[PDB]
Amino acid sequence: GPRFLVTAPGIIRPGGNVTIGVELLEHCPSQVTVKAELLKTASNLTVSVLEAEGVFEKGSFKTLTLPSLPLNSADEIYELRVTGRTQDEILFSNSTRLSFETKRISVFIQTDKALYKPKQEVKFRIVTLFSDFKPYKTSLNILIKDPKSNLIQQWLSQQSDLGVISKTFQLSSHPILGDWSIQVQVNDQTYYQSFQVSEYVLPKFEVTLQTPLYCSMNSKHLNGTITAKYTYGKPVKGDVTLTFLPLSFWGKKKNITKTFKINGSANFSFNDEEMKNVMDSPGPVEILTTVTESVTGISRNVSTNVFFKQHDYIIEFFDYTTVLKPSLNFTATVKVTRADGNQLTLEERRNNVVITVTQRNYTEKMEAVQKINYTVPQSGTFKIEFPILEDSSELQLKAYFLGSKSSMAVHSLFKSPSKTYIQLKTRDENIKVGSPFELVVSGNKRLKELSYMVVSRGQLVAVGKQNSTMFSLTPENSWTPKACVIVYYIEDDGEIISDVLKIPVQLVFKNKIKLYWSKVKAEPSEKVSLRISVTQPDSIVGIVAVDKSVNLMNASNDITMENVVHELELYNTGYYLGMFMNSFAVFQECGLWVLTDANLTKDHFPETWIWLDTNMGYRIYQEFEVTVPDSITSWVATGFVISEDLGLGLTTTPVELQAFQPFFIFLNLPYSVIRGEEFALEITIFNYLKDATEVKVIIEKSDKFDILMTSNEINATGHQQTLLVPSEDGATVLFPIRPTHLGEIPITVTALSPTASDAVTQMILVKAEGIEKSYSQSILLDLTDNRLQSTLKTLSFSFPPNTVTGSERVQITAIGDVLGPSINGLASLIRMPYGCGEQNMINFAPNIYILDYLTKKKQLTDNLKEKALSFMRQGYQRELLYQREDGSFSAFGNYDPSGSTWLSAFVLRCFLEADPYIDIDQNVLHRTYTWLKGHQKSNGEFWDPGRVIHSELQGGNKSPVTLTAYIVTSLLGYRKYQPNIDVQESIHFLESEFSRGISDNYTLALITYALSSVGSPKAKEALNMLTWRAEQEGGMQFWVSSESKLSDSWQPRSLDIEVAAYALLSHFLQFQTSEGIPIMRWLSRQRNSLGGFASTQDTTVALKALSEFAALMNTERTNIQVTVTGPSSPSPVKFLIDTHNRLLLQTAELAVVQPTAVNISANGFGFAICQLNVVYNVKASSIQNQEAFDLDVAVKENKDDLNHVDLNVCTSFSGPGRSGMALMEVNLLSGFMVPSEAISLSETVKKVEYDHGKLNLYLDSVNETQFCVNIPAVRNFKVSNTQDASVSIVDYYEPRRQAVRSYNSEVKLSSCDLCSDVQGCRPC
């Protein structure tokens, strides 16, 4: 008879012990020894990697566990060989292939949110656990990818402490929207986790559109309620425009227009016949509704999908035994419900379900269609348990009920020659780890000593023998997430009677964590404490706390039991046996290879509050104090704990804290107001109680504004107003406020309810009328010479006659470094916006140059280093937006017709220079270089297919020379990645063009810089020729290029600054310092109050030049005592500059007098820059003044209408040919906003940016043909006595080519139109 039944799983997994079940039956000779070995057939040879051996006794089902394969093993040809021998005979010796499973460890990536906004911090944790949820100490590499698959930021060789790595990643202001990715590279495997980044637009008001998802054709009443409500809680009293349309292409797809007043939330009861007509299983009905408030002009839309059930009743079959074993009892829990969701018990029971049983013998013999009437229970799962005849092959159950006469067919007859069958079954549902569960073994014949075996995650985790038909098993963590219990025994004839039950085992963790809130309900901005109680000391805990609104989207970025189950389900993988009609199939159904001599025959943006990460040491209980955020929400806290001994443990339930207040105050402030205007502060009191309350709103009296409410009551000045707030919102109390002082003003509104009180303080910026003008004058106190111990300079400025009194502001700064002022103003070097492609580099390349200068000078502080690198990463993230699909970079990304070689070269050079500091994706560099090198002509000339944005390089005459000289310099930094960049023909072309004769200063400067960078022998001649054209004046060298359309200003042209910077770089690259110093002196004295130069490009080039050249100066000691005494500073203001405060920008606010003047007296050694900054506002503003642009703003708006102001801005460029990229800044009138997508992008308007009451239009180019753009603005705040706003168009790369005009609406709100109908409020 049979003697052995050695069974092994068919898979191999690194890090998992291979266990082999050995059963020696009764008719076995003696104690055998079973050896097992894992052979690796990598090459043609076979290497016995692992092996095990054991002596097993007769009549005992035991296990043989191999040593675990090392976790770093790769996919090889693995073959498990088992050989069992006794004192003489070898009973069996066989081998089989093992399928390789690459899921070795469990890696969880936990981001605090699934959906992110721009300017948000992605906080992410990485948890690395073994298959048994113990911490896995390893060195992982973290990578972050944007949706275009660009390496944004990586961390390398991160050593995980108890398997947990906590990190943060700062998103930029304008990232690439889409699905980002986090990749964790443990060993040779990579684990992914995507988080979505999407832009957030203010929804204004929301619509709910509640409808039942599953309805029935026979349901008379169907209603869809649409709840329109403003964000402040007030319902919208608007007329819904509704379209109730199907997607049934065979139908008409007409829309029933139930367009009337919603009145907050109305009923929309429908008719059955009407819906039959509209229909004439459907495509789901799409409900689309829209409310449009007339004044705002804003409309919100929602799509709601409504599927359809055929009948009023729904009968569904599940939990059915997929194997039809004759002489056994079929069982299936069949649910009865109704499309409305209300079973209604007796009322819809209507007596019995016949549950027609169709038994068939599958002939072409025993054909029975008998029906058994059974009553419907209240639960609906009647769980019929009818028997099966001895030869029934096919079963069809047809439950005939009043609705949904559903059918089910099962066709799988288990084949057994002896007609012997068993069946493993379970009654329990909550099958957990450590909790025993019962198993019942039904059988149609005599049952012998059963033998069970459990397979889980492709590993044989338990064996044994049971002598009874009812036995209990206790799962362990290895059994999860889905065990497979195979019960079998062997009859006398060597037939294996067996059955499989697949049991979902719930996972219970030994490690336990409990979170407790101090208070279940707390007020906002209250200090509560979160209490963490863990099992054992030396545990690392990660706790997240998020708004209750989350999880309605089923966010996958959290360590919850669902995510743990999903992770564990990746272990349980393998081919599944569709058929189970034989014992061999029964064994194989859970991946088992059986070696036996028996007859085995083949046949929605949720904000985050707490991101706590604490390494609890000796403590098993720790309390952390936190502040409840101001918003009225509900915060649920969840967390995990990891310890070395017990492993992982999750919180069973999230614990909730309700942030509740009796009422809440909302203020609606205009952000900016001009001095002299009178705005209307509206305060809204959202009342959350269930009964009307009488709140009392008070504004704290301040000297920086006057409230115009001349109250009727005596004593009280009208700063207080009492009102009755009904339940659930309703208050819009208005205070007319006239600011008096300028700057930032705080307004503090305090509401005193009888029960509670609250206060809200908000800041309003009050500016001065007119256009803001600036002046800056710098001097370099070059006290290095010992003879020049004392130095006296004078800085003067005379205000224009049309200055706005009170808007003047004079200050003076001193700093002890040549590149000083650029250090402080790294965050913002220029006042222009940088939403375009090239301009964004103004927050990137200067960081490179400052870090290079400070590292060379050995003065780089850690804090400044980290700030600079953070700016570098933000600049890189923002810049990668403007990369086109063909690898190019353009000024406006993919909106441009084609990329620009000039800007691609600029970005390539900057990224190559930023390699040693931050991490740049090399694929971006490779694609950019590949795109560039296709544009080199036969003679070496580079040409730019992109749109001209810099008229000097790209446009004008000598364009090929400047483009070649720029791109040749930019490509040299790529010689690291490719030592054979063939630019010798380009160099020869530049040399020939230089020998031709260069007249312009800018072209010659670029030629000199190119020839110096490539070390061409003509470079010395070019630089000598460029120097001799300079202006030697006052120990300074500079180049002045004349133009008759530049507004007079302190600052020179961008072209002149670039010329000086390139000449200085040429002097540096040729190792000529003494004759380069004057250019350094001049270049250092032409910066603005922010430490930057005029435009973006000139600023980057000049900062590069000053960083490269200032590093060669000797400033080892500097001790300067600057004294500032003059008419504008009566008291002598003294700045001390030492070797410690070298980079400190020492500032002092001077008085305002006409004319401003200061004498600066300095004594000592070293370099010091002293700068006088004046900021003022001229009153008002083509004509005889020097303006390159002719601008005209015509405000056309009806006098009767006070809410809409449409202005037509017509501009033209009276200059040589076309201009470069231009910027139009439209300042809106106080209390006016331009709705989004109001200005359509066109061939001219390339980008519209909506700042706070300001529009930045990036015009492509302006020429002599008049270009007119319409700006429609809609009132959102009531502001009386509005002051004139301004429209200013400038050339981006030459700000002195500018034109500014003033405008104002011809109709104004009066002083007392601000007040509402409230009593006691009398401004007129």
Ligand X SMILES: *[C@@H]1O[C@H](CO)[C@@H](O)[C@H](O)[C@H]1NC(C)=O
Ligand Y SMILES: *[C@@H]1O[C@H](CO)[C@@H](O[C@@H]2O[C@H](CO)[C@@H](O)[C@H](O)[C@H]2NC(C)=O)[C@H](O)[C@H]1NC(C)=O
327 binds, among ligand Y, ligand X, none (CB under 5 to 8 A by kind): none
1042 binds, among ligand X, ligand Y, none (CB under 5 to 8 A by kind): ligand Y
Residues 537, 614: Cα–Cα separation, whole Å = 12
The Cα angle at residue 160 between residues 156 and 161, in degrees rounded to 5 = 145
Q: Residue 1265 interacts with ligand X (CB under 6 A)?
A: yes
Residues 1174, 767: Cα–Cα separation, whole Å = 16
Alpha carbons within 13 A on the beta-carbon side of 560: 14
Q: Residue 1012 interacts with ligand Y (CB under 6 A)?
A: no
Nearer to ligand Y, 84 or 1126 (CB): 1126
Spell out, one character per residue from 427 to 456, where the chain touches ligand X: x when CB under 6 A holds, - when not.
---------------x--------------
CA neighbor of 880 nearest in space, from 172, 179, 201? 172
Q: How far is the CB of 1018 from ligand Y (least distance, A)?
A: 20
Alpha carbon of 828 to those of 823, 871, 1076, 1142: distances in Å? 10, 10, 28, 21
| Total residue count of the chain as it appears in this document | 1324
Are 66 and 50 in contact by the 8 Å Cβ rule? The answer is yes
Token digits of residue 1027: 């120097």
> Cα-flanking dihedrals φ and ψ of residue 183, to 5°?
-120, 125
Q: How far is the CB of 878 from ligand Y (least distance, A)?
A: 35
Figure out which of the listed residues 438, 700, 1031, 1149 binds ligand Y, where binding follows CB under 6 A: 1031
Residues 911, 845: Cα–Cα separation, whole Å = 8
Residues 6+ apart with CB under 8 A from 189: 102, 104
Residues 1101, 846: Cα–Cα separation, whole Å = 9
Residues 639, 648: Cα–Cα separation, whole Å = 11
Count, residues near ligand X per rule CB under 6 A: 13
Residues 171, 294: Cα–Cα separation, whole Å = 37
720 binds, among ligand Y, ligand X, none (CB under 5 to 8 A by kind): none
Q: Residue 1040 interacts with ligand Y (CB under 6 A)?
A: yes
> Of the listed pieces 133-141, 654-662, 727-735, 993-1001, which binds ligand Y according to CB under 6 A?
993-1001
Nearer to ligand X, 265 or 329 (CB): 329
Are 1101 and 1066 in contact by the 8 Å Cβ rule? The answer is no
65 binds, among ligand Y, ligand X, none (CB under 5 to 8 A by kind): ligand X
Residues 71, 942: Cα–Cα separation, whole Å = 54
What amino acid is encoded at 617 in this protein?
Answer: G
Token digits of residue 60: 């005992």
Strand partners, 904: none
Q: Residue 57 interacts with ligand X (CB under 6 A)?
A: no
Spell out, one character per residue from 570 to 609, where the chain touches ligand X: x when CB under 6 A holds, - when not.
-------------------------x--------------
Angle of the 959-972 helix axis to the 984-996 helix axis, nearest 10: 140
Figure out which of the listed residues 29, 67, 203, 1155 binds ligand X, where binding follows CB under 6 A: 67
Q: How many CB atoms lie within 10 A of CB 35?
A: 15
Q: Residue 1264 interacts with ligand X (CB under 6 A)?
A: yes
Residue with tokens 């009920």, as numbered in its chain: 401
> Of the listed pieces 151-159, 889-897, 1033-1041, 1097-1105, which binds ligand Y according to CB under 6 A?
1033-1041
Q: In what order do the strands lie in the sheet with 121-129?
A: 106-111, 121-129, 164-170
Are 8 and 460 in contact by the 8 Å Cβ rule? The answer is yes
1264 binds, among ligand Y, ligand X, none (CB under 5 to 8 A by kind): ligand X
Q: How far is the CB of 83 from ligand X (least distance, A)?
A: 10
Q: In what order do the strands lie in the sheet with 1285-1291?
A: 1245-1251, 1254-1259, 1222-1227, 1285-1291, 1294-1303
Figure out which of the listed residues 999, 1074, 1240, 1265 binds ligand Y, where binding follows CB under 6 A: 999
Q: How far is the CB of 432 from ligand X (least distance, A)?
A: 24
Nearer to ligand X, 219 or 1214 (CB): 1214
Q: How far is the CB of 1030 from ligand Y (least distance, A)?
A: 6
Query: Which DSSP state fits 980?
Result: T
1130 binds, among ligand X, ligand Y, none (CB under 5 to 8 A by kind): none
Q: Residue 149 interacts with ligand Y (CB under 6 A)?
A: no
> Of the listed pieces 61-69, 149-157, 580-588, 1000-1008, which binds ligand X according to CB under 6 A?
61-69
Nearer to ligand X, 19 or 901 (CB): 19
Q: Residue 1000 interacts with ligand Y (CB under 6 A)?
A: yes
Q: Residue 702 interacts with ligand X (CB under 6 A)?
A: no
> Of the listed pieces 91-99, 423-431, 948-956, 995-1003, which binds ligand Y according to CB under 6 A?
995-1003
> Of the listed pieces 603-611, 647-655, 821-829, 1040-1048, which binds ligand Y according to CB under 6 A?
1040-1048
Token digits of residue 1313: 């139109």
Nearer to ligand Y, 999 or 1074 (CB): 999
Residues 6+ apart with CB under 8 A from 662: 687, 688, 689, 693, 753, 755, 756
Token digits of residue 1080: 């350094």
What amino acid is encoded at 831 in this protein?
Answer: R
Radius of gyration of the chain (CA): 40
Alpha helices in 858-891 (DSSP H): 862-879
Are 500 and 580 in contact by the 8 Å Cβ rule? The answer is yes
Q: How far is the CB of 1042 from ligand Y (least distance, A)?
A: 5
Residues 191, 183: Cα–Cα separation, whole Å = 6
Residues 182, 179: Cα–Cα separation, whole Å = 10
Query: Which DSSP state fits 1062?
Result: H
Figure out which of the listed residues 1126, 1166, 1215, 1295 binds ligand Y, where binding follows CB under 6 A: 1126
Figure out which of the listed residues 303, 363, 1042, 1044 binds ligand Y, where binding follows CB under 6 A: 1042
Nearer to ligand Y, 39 or 1030 (CB): 1030
17 binds, among ligand Y, ligand X, none (CB under 5 to 8 A by kind): ligand X
Nearer to ligand X, 595 or 868 (CB): 595
Q: How far is the CB of 1074 from ligand Y (least distance, A)?
A: 20
Spell out, one character per residue from 89 to 128, where the chain touches ligand X: x when CB under 6 A holds, - when not.
-----x----------------------------------
Q: Residue 329 interacts with ligand X (CB under 6 A)?
A: yes
59 binds, among ligand Y, ligand X, none (CB under 5 to 8 A by kind): none
94 binds, among ligand Y, ligand X, none (CB under 5 to 8 A by kind): ligand X
> Of the listed pieces 513-521, 1024-1032, 1279-1287, 1291-1299, which binds ligand Y according to CB under 6 A?
1024-1032
Q: Residue 1015 interacts with ligand X (CB under 6 A)?
A: no
Q: Residue 1184 interacts with ligand Y (CB under 6 A)?
A: no
Nearer to ligand X, 83 or 563 (CB): 83
Q: Residue 794 interacts with ligand Y (CB under 6 A)?
A: yes
Q: How far is the CB of 1268 from ligand X (least distance, A)?
A: 13
Under rule CB under 6 A, which residues in 359-388 are in contact with ligand X?
385, 387
Alpha carbon of 644 to those of 536, 586, 592, 1019: distances in Å? 10, 39, 33, 67
Strand partners, 523: none
Nearer to ligand Y, 339 or 1026 (CB): 1026
Q: After which residues does the chain break, using C–N > 2.5 Å? A: 280, 364, 603, 1181
> Of the listed pieces 286-294, 719-727, 1064-1072, 1263-1271, which binds ligand X according to CB under 6 A?
1263-1271
Angle of the 1001-1013 helix axis to the 959-972 helix axis, nearest 10: 30
> Which residues contribute to the site for ligand Y (CB under 6 A)?
794, 999-1001, 1029-1031, 1039-1042, 1125-1126, 1159
> Which residues contribute to the site for ligand X (CB under 6 A)?
17, 65, 67-68, 94, 329, 385, 387, 442, 595, 1263-1265
